[PDB]
Design a protein around this ligand. Structure first.
Ligand SMILES: [Cu+2]
Ligand SMILES: [Cu+2]
Ligand SMILES: [Cu+2]
Ligand SMILES: [Cu+2]
Length: 487
């Protein structure tokens, strides 16, 4: 999908494992939203046409372009009742933003309730004509993009026990009977090197990713190019994205591509949680290859390519702004808490209350879930390792100066990305960013069912500069009036 494109949103009855069709939310006709691409600095004009009719899900919609900074285009970011009011059925809205200096692997998904778990999700790649990693691969195209998703047999409409089927490129098996399901085939040729862009479109579990008999060389992490680091296995979290170069150097043949979920049926019995890596000329056949070898990816081992300074001073507590975020709960699942306040979405989108003249955070809503950050400042965020939550910051990436699983602080060359697991009981994951982006920017667990429960806070960054920095098209202006009239 192009730079100026339409993108109808519509239900359709999909049956990705062969077990039984279900009514889902999607873009166009596919269980994986259609790949979108451009180039660095391109200007996207993405006409979303809401055409939804299944009243058992949500029929409104709002799309987020994950990992794009949206500087000057905060109204386009996508979060429901943060940056916009939802688009109504029988209406449309053109998200129009630029991607100045960002090439890499992103994705896009609904950001209204848990509606992306009913289907609205897919890949977004921004190529770099001048990419420093070009020499490390012969192939990078629509065929080298690899999506993982957790699929639900029942409409979204809690903390659901777990997903039902792991789909790779929208395909995979389940145990109604695994044989009911197709396997996704990623095709390669001997001697060729491939930039696979691996996209977790997941609403919840993390996956342990691997390619039987093959090594993976990491060059890119959540949009950002890193020094080439070679591994055999990988855990990818909700919303995360890695590029890995895979050389087809083993014996011509079939090989399992593995994706072990953190929740739901795990393991590979029957070929669940799998896909096929097949060589030109191999038999059209089911793999029989055995899984992985030692060298797992450790986040603490990735280094950003182009010289990044973990902003600020190299002491924890050394940023200009140090906030410590602690997570609280609630029995069932409808009230998560951070520093004693759940995220409860207001009727007035936080961008709206601000543009309107509500500048003191104290008066913003919801109460306490919103923190104002001052401009051109260095921020240190710590989140006491709760229970494996993949936290995601909008409008920015960050240096994770303390990686899940390592008592050290690294201000020298920490990983930079935009989704990070807080690990659990033992961890104190901390990162740092710079508030150079006037905007109300979300920070939430990317476990979709946790955000729906209130696990989230809104960063109202450079409040004085938001109306000025952001130029608001009349079409943004009537989302809320047309939504608030609904029925
Ligand atoms: Cu996302
Ligand atoms: Cu995002
Ligand atoms: Cu979570
Ligand atoms: Cu978000």
């Amino acid at each position: 999908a192009t730079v100026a494109l339409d993108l109808h949103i519509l239900n359709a009855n999909l049956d990705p494992d062969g077990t039984g069709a279900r009514s889902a939310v999607t873009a166009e006709g596919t269980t994986i939203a259609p790949l979108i691409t451009g180039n660095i600095d391109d200007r996207f004009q993405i006409n979303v046409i809401d055409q939804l009719t299944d009243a058992n899900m949500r029929r409104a919609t709002s799309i987020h372009w994950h990992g794009f900074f949206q500087a000057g285009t905060t109204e386009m970011d996508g979060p429901a009742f943060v940056n916009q009011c939802p688009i109504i059925p029988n209406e449309s809205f053109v998200y129009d933003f630029v991607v100045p200096g960002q090439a890499g692997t992103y994705w896009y998904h609904s950001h209204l309730s848990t509606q992306y778990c009913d289907g609205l999700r897919g890949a977004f790649v921004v190529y770099d004509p001048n990419d420093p990693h070009l020499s490390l691969y012969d192939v990078d195209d629509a065929s080298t993009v690899i999506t993982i998703a957790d699929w639900y047999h029942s409409l979204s409409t809690k903390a659901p026990p777990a997903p039902d089927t792991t789909l790779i490129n929208g395909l995979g098996r389940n145990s109604a009977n695994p044989s009911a399901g197709q396997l996704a085939v990623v095709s390669v040729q001997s001697g060729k090197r491939y930039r696979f862009r691996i996209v977790s479109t997941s609403c919840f579990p993390n996956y342990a990713f691997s390619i039987d008999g093959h090594r993976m060389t990491v060059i890119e992490v959540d949009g950002v190019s890193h020094q080439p680091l070679t591994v055999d296995s990988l855990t990818i979290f909700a919303g995360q994205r890695y590029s890995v170069v895979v050389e087809a150097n083993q014996a011509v043949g079939n090989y399992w591509i593995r994706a072990n979920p953190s929740n739901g049926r795990n393991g590979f019995t029957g070929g669940i949680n799998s896909a096929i890596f097949r060589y030109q000329g191999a038999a059209v056949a089911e793999p029989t290859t055995s899984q992985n070898s030692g060298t797992a990816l450790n986040e603490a081992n990735l280094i950003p390519l182009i010289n990044p300074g973990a902003p600020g001073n190299p002491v924890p507590g050394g940023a200009d702004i140090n906030l410590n975020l602690r997570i609280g709960r609630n029995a069932t699942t409808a009230d998560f808490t951070i520093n004693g306040a759940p995220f409860i979405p207001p009727t007035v989108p936080v961008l709206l209350q601000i543009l309107s003249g509500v500048t003191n955070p104290n008066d913003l809503l919801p109460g306490g879930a919103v923190i104002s950050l001052p401009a051109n400042q260095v921020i240190e965020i710590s989140i006491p390792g709760g229970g494996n939550h993949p936290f995601h910051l909008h409008g920015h990436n960050f240096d994770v100066v303390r990686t899940p699983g390592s008592s050290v602080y690294n201000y020298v060359n920490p990983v930079r990305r935009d989704v990070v697991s807080i690990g659990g009981g033992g961890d104190n994951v901390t990162f740092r960013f710079v508030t150079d982006n006037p905007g109300p920017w979300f920070l939430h667990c990317h476990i979709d069912w946790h955000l729906e429960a209130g696990l989230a806070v809104v960063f109202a960054e450079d409040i004085p500069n938001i109306p000025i920095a952001n130029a608001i098209s009349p079409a943004w202006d009537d989302l809320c009036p047309k939504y608030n009239a609904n029925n």
